[PDB]
């Protein structure tokens, strides 16, 4: 529908958003995608302004997240002074 690349500089509190989903822990019914579930006021992602709630995380750096477990994507995001996000919306 629309793919976008977004680069975030990690802040003192991390990236300032939350995610749910994955092959091990779907967030919707029979949906394994990793979705953005919250963008925190005052965090790096909100300051950037581009990330939206329910964006699908397609890739983190050069690592695709389309059929992966939750903690895999978590490790990509949490470990990393600058992180390149490819998302779908």
């Amino acid at each position: 529908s629309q793919y976008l690349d977004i680069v975030l500089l990690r802040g003192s509190s991390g990236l300032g958003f939350s995610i749910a989903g994955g092959t091990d822990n779907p967030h919707f019914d029979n949906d394994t995608s990793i979705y953005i579930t919250k963008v925190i006021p005052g965090g790096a992602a909100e300051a950037d302004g581009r990330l939206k709630v329910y964006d699908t995380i397609v890739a983190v750096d050069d690592q695709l997240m389309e059929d992966v477990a939750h903690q895999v994507c978590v490790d990509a995001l949490k470990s990393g002074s600058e992180v390149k996000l490819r998302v779908k919306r």
Partner: peptide
Amino acid sequence: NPNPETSV
């Protein structure tokens, strides 16, 4: 339950 989530 629905509350599994991770903040990053």
